[PDB]
Write a protein that binds this ligand. Structure first.
Ligand SMILES: Nc1nc2c(ncn2[C@@H]2O[C@H](COP(=O)(O)OP(=O)(O)NP(=O)(O)O)[C@@H](O)[C@H]2O)c(=O)[nH]1
Ligand SMILES: [Mg+2]
Ligand SMILES: [Mg+2]
Ligand SMILES: [Mg+2]
Ligand SMILES: [Mg+2]
Ligand SMILES: [Mg+2]
Ligand SMILES: [Mg+2]
Ligand SMILES: [Mg+2]
Ligand SMILES: [Mg+2]
Ligand SMILES: [Mg+2]
Ligand SMILES: [Mg+2]
Ligand SMILES: [Mg+2]
Ligand SMILES: [Mg+2]
Ligand SMILES: [Mg+2]
Ligand SMILES: [Mg+2]
Ligand SMILES: [Mg+2]
Ligand SMILES: [Mg+2]
Ligand SMILES: [Mg+2]
Ligand SMILES: [Mg+2]
Ligand SMILES: [Mg+2]
Ligand SMILES: [Mg+2]
Ligand SMILES: [Mg+2]
Ligand SMILES: [Mg+2]
Ligand SMILES: [Zn+2]
Lengths: 129, 104, 88, 14
RNA sequence: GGCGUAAAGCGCACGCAGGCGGUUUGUUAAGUCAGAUGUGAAAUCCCCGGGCUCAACCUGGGAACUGCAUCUGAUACUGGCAAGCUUGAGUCUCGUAGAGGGGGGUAGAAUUCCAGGUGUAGCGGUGAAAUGCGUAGAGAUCUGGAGGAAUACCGGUGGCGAAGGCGGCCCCCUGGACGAAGACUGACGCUCAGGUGCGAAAGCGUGGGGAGCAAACAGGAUUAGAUACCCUGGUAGUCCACGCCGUAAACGAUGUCGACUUGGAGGUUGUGCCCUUGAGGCGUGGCUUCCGGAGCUAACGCGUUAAGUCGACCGCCUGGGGA
RNA sequence: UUAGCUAGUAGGUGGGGUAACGGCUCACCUAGGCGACGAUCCCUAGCUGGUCUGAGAGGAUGACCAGCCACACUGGAACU
């Protein structure tokens, strides 16, 4: 079903980015806000808005270069069938340090570049390539 | 039920108590007539040697041709009609075996 | 399943009001009376394996609904199992 | 292909 | 790493255990993460050296040994507890469509049998013949009666059912699917090893039934032989009850569920609004076929019903033959 | 193509026993115990630090060195 809504979130981003869609909407949650707000601060997307309180609806503004996909590919890493965890020195890089890896720790959701100054490890969410 | 079975193989050699050898044969139901012309079919029967050159024409199919002296010998009774009707069955078999092609 | 007089009565029997029709205890009673309605049917019609699929669906549906009240509040669970004649 | 399938029985080495 | 056609998705369904799980808050700190302690014998390997004239070799210290245990921390995610919430999954009403299944009647053609009437030399069959049938009158036609099984047209990539499958009409019992308006419970869910049930036809057991068709078999042609083809007959079987057997090219050769991603030609089934100004106009759900963009694929092709991009779970394959 | 195994077996009492706890042993009492997270049965095998292979993850193996266990013709027993 919708057992991995983060994988459902990454499905809706990769489709609309490739099919030249201007903006998408999706059901919101606390975890989907904490990931899209990081992608807004890392130049991958443009803006996010929330709509509705009894039915929380998250919106994302897409981003293009000259009509080209900014987010070329994104890869869900951990999953409910197999959980993935790393330490503070085993955090993997994406495209040898070009792409970022979204890792949620006890100090909130940050990147692997931001986790070096934080010195923590935890759950890998997605490889933002 | 009403047929025969070929159990023994191709040929096994032995000797007579007097002299000579024996050669067994398979159960064979085959007829290979791809060898030569139908002129040699006329030579394949003994009593039909003495009746050649007696018909009307110098070439004769001996089935639908008028004045066949070989057919007159069958109608007289010196040649049995079982051999004559089987003779043109050989010729009509060559109209059915030859169809696709075969050559050595 | 049943008629309108048989449906609306049992909702008023086990529900708090006329609007109490979506709760789990009402849904058990809709399946309990229906299986009790089909006792004499499948005895005479043992070659009807297609209606038996609808029967075994409601048996599996009622078993899943009894497991929800049992894991949450056993006080209402022990009331309904003897009020309808369950647990065999 | 499923990891949870290989929990019951691993890949059979010939 | 694969499972439409190269080897591979169980014939299908239910469902326990197992795995997995919407959303909001609090708590626990289990999992995970941070730090510290103890420990992980030496040797081997690695780093910098030293030494044997060199190298192999020996050897100093460090690193490593990604391990385990305990303590102190952090709480985003996962787990547990607690309170919920409603879009998931369900419930009620009003409805609509349908060969969904089971049971009990009934209809009229057609086939064969039988009775009667009129009527005469062939009927029948094939490429051509023959077996067979008929002057006890066949065949053909008409009247009357019996029995058996199947339902022309409608009828269509049409509908329904989990699948195999399901078709005269009518009644009785009963199953699901879908649409509209709201009300209501509050994750009640997905999935499935064993287990459980259904499951084309043939065949088997018991007892009935018997038209037509038809293994074995009878007869006639065909033929080198005819065993098959073709023709005239014909038992088992096909029919029903009661069991058993559980295999198919049981195929969409695609396991189930959910989420999104340009679209047309249609079909079927509803619903909402509209000079009702026509069975129309405009939308909008359920089911289904043919094309086709991006994309994917070995090609063929698939392409909003995916074989596109993903997640949840399960089955199965590892050269051909042996098998 | 191993699914049920087990009566000193599982637990308790008391006595006895060993350097030490203990069905270790005995009488009695209870009917449990183990097990689809592989009990039990069959076959094979000393194990580990390691070595070798491999980019790594893995794979194969346990000679020489070192640690431990077991064995000393076969089987059984106790003394010191
Ligand atoms: N009554 C009878 N039976 C005979 C006679 N000759 C042979 N038979 C039988 O006929 C059968 C056939 O004999 P066989 O010689 O085997 O035939 P074949 O031609 O050799 N057969 P194949 O083609 O296999 O070689 C045998 O059973 C034999 O006993 C005879 O004169 N009288
Ligand atoms: Mg109904
Ligand atoms: Mg391959
Ligand atoms: Mg194949
Ligand atoms: Mg199938
Ligand atoms: Mg050491
Ligand atoms: Mg050292
Ligand atoms: Mg060293
Ligand atoms: Mg030197
Ligand atoms: Mg939680
Ligand atoms: Mg009739
Ligand atoms: Mg409420
Ligand atoms: Mg029999
Ligand atoms: Mg025949
Ligand atoms: Mg029978
Ligand atoms: Mg099969
Ligand atoms: Mg096809
Ligand atoms: Mg194209
Ligand atoms: Mg297409
Ligand atoms: Mg093989
Ligand atoms: Mg004691
Ligand atoms: Mg040994
Ligand atoms: Mg030693
Ligand atoms: Zn002549």
């Amino acid at each position: 079903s919708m057992q991995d809504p983060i994988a459902d979130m990454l499905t809706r981003i990769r489709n609309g980015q490739a099919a030249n869609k201007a903006a998408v909407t999706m059901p919101s949650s606390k975890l989907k806000v904490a990931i899209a707000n990081v992608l807004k601060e890392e130049g991958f997307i443009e803006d996010f808005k929330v709509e509705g309180d009894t039915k929380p609806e998250l919106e994302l503004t897409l981003k293009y270069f000259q009509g080209k996909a900014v987010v070329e590919s994104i890869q869900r890493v951990s999953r409910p069938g197999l959980r993935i965890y790393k330490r503070k020195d085993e955090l993997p890089k994406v495209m040898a340090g070009l792409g970022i890896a979204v890792v949620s720790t006890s100090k909130g959701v940050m990147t692997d570049r931001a986790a070096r100054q934080a010195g923590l490890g935890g759950e890998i969410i997605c490889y933002v390539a | 039920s009403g047929l025969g079975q070929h159990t023994t193989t191709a040929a096994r050699l032995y000797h007579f108590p007097h002299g000579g050898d024996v050669i067994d044969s398979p159960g064979v139901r085959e007829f290979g007539l791809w060898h030569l012309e139908p002129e040699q079919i006329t030579q394949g029967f003994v009593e039909f040697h003495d009746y050649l050159g007696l018909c009307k024409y110098r070439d004769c199919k001996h089935d639908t041709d008028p004045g066949c002296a070989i057919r007159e010998a069958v109608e007289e009774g010196k040649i049995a009609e079982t051999r004559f009707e089987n003779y043109h069955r050989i010729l009509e078999s060559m109209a059915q075996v030859k169809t696709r092609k075969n050559f050595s | 399943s049943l008629s309108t007089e048989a449906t609306a009565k049992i909702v008023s029997e086990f529900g708090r009001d006329a609007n109490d029709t979506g709760s789990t205890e009402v849904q058990v009673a809709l399946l309990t009376a229906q299986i009790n309605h089909l006792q004499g049917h499948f005895a005479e019609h043992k070659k009807d394996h297609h209606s038996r699929r609808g029967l075994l669906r409601m048996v599996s549906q009622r078993r899943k609904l009894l497991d929800y009240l049992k894991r949450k509040d056993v006080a209402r669970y022990t009331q309904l199992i003897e009020r309808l004649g369950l647990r065999r | 292909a499923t990891v949870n399938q290989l929990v019951r029985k691993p890949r059979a080495r010939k």
